[PDB]
Amino acid sequence: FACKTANGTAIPIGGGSANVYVNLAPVVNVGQNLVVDLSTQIFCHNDYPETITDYVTLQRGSAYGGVLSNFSGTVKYSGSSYPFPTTSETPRVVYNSRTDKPWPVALYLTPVSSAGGVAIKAGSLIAVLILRQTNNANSDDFQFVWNIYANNDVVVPT
Ligand SMILES: O=C(O)CN(CCN(CC(=O)O)CC(=O)O)CC(=O)O
């Protein structure tokens, strides 16, 4: 089991970490959601699908910088919604193919009442998402750590 980002950075068997640089909507009004869809940026595959089933969770998601200060969050994982920053590990998603498939994570971020101006600075760390990978054969328990960085400013107009 291994993962890759949309620009080709890999995390190999056994886990590791990588940076993910994401374009964000440059403006988000009070009452609207800023969507950070990681499913178009993070992909994973099972190397030996005839031999083993791999299981994948969002073990935890943390917010940083302007996301932590200026937004109220939820994370959708494989169709279900949870608080973001997270308070529990999600259910497991099955990976059963050598073809890379999306990691089905999206953040829904709406401005807090105090947000105004540049609410996320371009280049800043906005999130760390920990993917936990297990399997149905042995006790392997691997962490794939995704450090999410903003490519551009996000403005909340005032
Ligand atoms: O997980 C696999 O793909 C192969 N499994 C078999 C698990 N299968 C049972 C079966 O194929 O009859 C679970 C499944 O139904 O996918 C071997 C193992 O026990 O580690």
Residue numbers in the entry: 1 to 158
Paper text:
E. coli clinical isolates express the FimH adhesin, which consists of a mannose-specific lectin domain connected via a pilin domain to the tip of type 1 pili. The FimH lectin binds specifically to mannose moieties displayed on glycoproteins at the luminal surface of epithelial cells. Mannose binds in a deep and polar pocket at the N-terminal end of FimH, in which the amino acids Phe1, Asn46, Asp47, Asp54, Gln133, Asn135, Asp140 and Phe142 create a dense network of 12 hydrogen bonds with each hydroxyl group of the pyran­ose ring except that at the α-anomeric position of mannose. The interaction of the aglycones with the tyrosine gate formed by two tyrosines (Tyr48 and Tyr137) at the entrance to the FimH binding site contributes significantly to their affinity, for example with a 400-fold increase for HM compared with α-d-manno­pyranoside.
The Y137A mutation, on the other hand, is the most detrimental to FimH affinity and specificity: (i) in the absence of ligand the FimH C-terminal residue Thr158 intrudes into the mannose-binding pocket and (ii) ethylenediaminetetraacetic acid interacts strongly with Glu50, Thr53 and Asn136, in spite of multiple dialysis and purification steps. The ligand-free state of Y137A FimH permits the C-terminal carboxylate of a neighbouring molecule to enter its mannose-binding pocket. The Val155-Val156-Pro157-Thr158 peptide of the FimH lectin domain from an adjacent symmetry-related lectin domain makes a significant intrusion where the oligomannoside glycan is normally bound. In addition, an EDTA buffer molecule is bound in different alternate conformations into a cavity on the FimH surface. Remarkably, EDTA was only contained in the extraction buffer of FimH extraction from the E. coli periplasm, but remained bound during purification and dialysis steps, which did not contain EDTA (see also §2). The EDTA binding site is very close to the mannose-binding pocket and the two sites are coupled by residue Ile52. The Ile52-mediated connection might be needed in WT FimH for proper guidance of the ligand to its binding site. Ile52 is also the residue directly linking the protein-intruded mannose-binding site inside the Y137A mutant FimH, with the EDTA binding site formed by Asn136, Thr53 and Glu50 at the protein surface. The Y137A mutant structure allows the binding of a macromolecule other than mannose in the FimH mannose-binding pocket to be observed for the first time and moreover exposes a hitherto undiscovered adjacent binding pocket on the FimH surface. In the ligand-free state of Y137A FimH, several of the binding-site residues (including Asn136, Tyr137 and Tyr48) already sample backbone dihedral angles that are normally only found in wild-type FimH upon binding of the mannose. In the crystals of the Y137A mutant, a breakdown of the binding site with a severe loss of specificity is observed.
